[PDB]
């Protein structure tokens, strides 16, 4: 299962 | 042996042609088990292994929601990084992200990782201790400061050391019939005449899993890298892999050369010799 969400760069 | 779960995310901008291409793939060891492709019909995370298909609708809805969020972040990032480097709107650019976790033979957490690239080279990466970042240049330092302010490392560490490994263990159990298998390489050797006085010896490994393998040539028992060629390990398409290693030798001296094959499925390494 993937990470919940990714932060913008 | 050890096991891994890894996710790979690629976004590619399309100047003058709309939204970026986005492709996500998930692997357990050398076995793909999910994908998302912006080009495809469903716009959902999709199964690519029978042992993941069995997960229920809440799993697939959740993975779809989260992977769409990944896609959105990449779409913003392409614009942001274009800004950081003051690049024009004329060119296509690439964002790549890889993250995941390794467990040992005891299935206990071994290590975690998260790497991020812009246009094919390192941009920013989590350090091994999962507590700080390595940035490639000043532009990437901007991102580093943002992720420090947002305490991304803390959250990500919680995922890599916990959730990631929990998923990996679940998958390893459910897909045990294929994931916890070892397929030993089938080996053989061929010969070509290069000229009247030179010959190519080619050492073959076929039908093996996992992909990790070592093929080495030796002359009189000493390692030889000179006049050798190693092709990239390649998928057969049936879940197994192939590789070969060749050496150019003086005609008549074939017997001095031995190919050595190391694989998980070979407790005793193999030594092949030309007839």
């Amino acid at each position: 299962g993937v990470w919940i969400r990714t932060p913008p760069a | 042996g050890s096991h891994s779960m890894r996710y790979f995310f690629t976004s590619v901008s399309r100047p003058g042609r709309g939204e970026p291409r986005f492709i996500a793939v998930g692997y357990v060891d050398d076995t793909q088990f999910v994908r998302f492709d912006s080009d495809a019909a469903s716009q959902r995370m999709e199964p690519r292994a029978p042992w993941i298909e069995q997960e229920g609708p809440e799993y697939w809805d959740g993975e779809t929601r989260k992977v769409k969020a990944h896609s959105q972040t990449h779409r913003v990032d392409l614009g942001t990084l274009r800004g950081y480097y003051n690049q024009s709107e004329a060119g296509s650019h690439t964002v790549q992200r890889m993250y995941g976790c390794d467990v040992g033979s005891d299935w206990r957490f071994l290590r975690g990782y998260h790497q991020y690239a812009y246009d094919g080279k390192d941009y920013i990466a989590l350090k091994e201790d999962l507590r700080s970042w390595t940035a490639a240049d000043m532009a990437a330092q901007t991102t580093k400061h943002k992720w420090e302010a947002a305490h991304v490392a803390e959250q990500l560490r919680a995922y890599l050391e916990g959730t990631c490994v929990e998923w990996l263990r679940r998958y390893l159990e459910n897909g045990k019939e294929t994931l916890q298998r070892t397929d030993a390489p089938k080996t053989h050797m061929t010969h070509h005449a290069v000229s009247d006085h030179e010959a190519t010896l080619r050492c073959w490994a076929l039908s093996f899993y996992p992909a990790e393998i070592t093929l080495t040539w030796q002359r009189d028992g000493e390692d030889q890298t000179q006049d050798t060629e190693l092709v990239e390990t390649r998928p057969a398409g049936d879940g197994t892999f192939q590789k070969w290693a060749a050496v150019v030798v003086p005609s008549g001296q074939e017997q001095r050369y031995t190919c050595h094959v190391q694989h998980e499925g070979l407790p005793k390494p193999l030594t092949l010799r030309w007839e």
């Binding site: - | 790979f8 690629t10 590619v12 291409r21 492709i23 793939v25 692997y27 793909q32 994908r35 492709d37 690519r48 060119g91 296509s92 690439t94 790549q96 890889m98 690239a117 246009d119 094919g120 080279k121 390192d122 061929t190 070509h192 080619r202 076929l206 092709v231 990239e232 390649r234 998928p235 057969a236 398409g237 049936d238 192939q242 070969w244």
Partner: protein
């Protein structure tokens, strides 16, 4: 901007035997950027029913793709893989060699 030339391998899933069903593979690896043309050719003409893997990449960020088609090799039929990429001055055609 990283530009990496594709490494191209053309081979069969199983040991080739004329008259027996098999899969013809074209594996392209180690390339960047991701935009790439890959076609399988039978006697100089492109094969339509070709599948391809989901774009993924290696530790050095370079991409890899597998294109494959079901086929029955014969003594007469010539197979090849045509690849085009920004790193190539012209399209590269790699013939199927049964020992490569």
């Amino acid at each position: 901007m990283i530009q990496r030339t594709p490494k191209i391998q053309v081979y069969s899933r199983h040991p080739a035997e004329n008259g027996k069903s098999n899969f013809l593979n074209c594996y392209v690896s180690g390339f960047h950027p991701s935009d790439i043309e890959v076609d399988l050719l039978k006697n100089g003409e492109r094969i339509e029913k070709v599948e391809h893997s989901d774009l993924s990449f290696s530790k050095d960020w370079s991409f890899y793709l597998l294109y494959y088609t079901e086929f029955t090799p014969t003594e007469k039929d010539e197979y090849a893989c045509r690849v085009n990429h920004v790193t190539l001055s012209q399209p590269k055609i790699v013939k199927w060699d049964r020992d490569m």
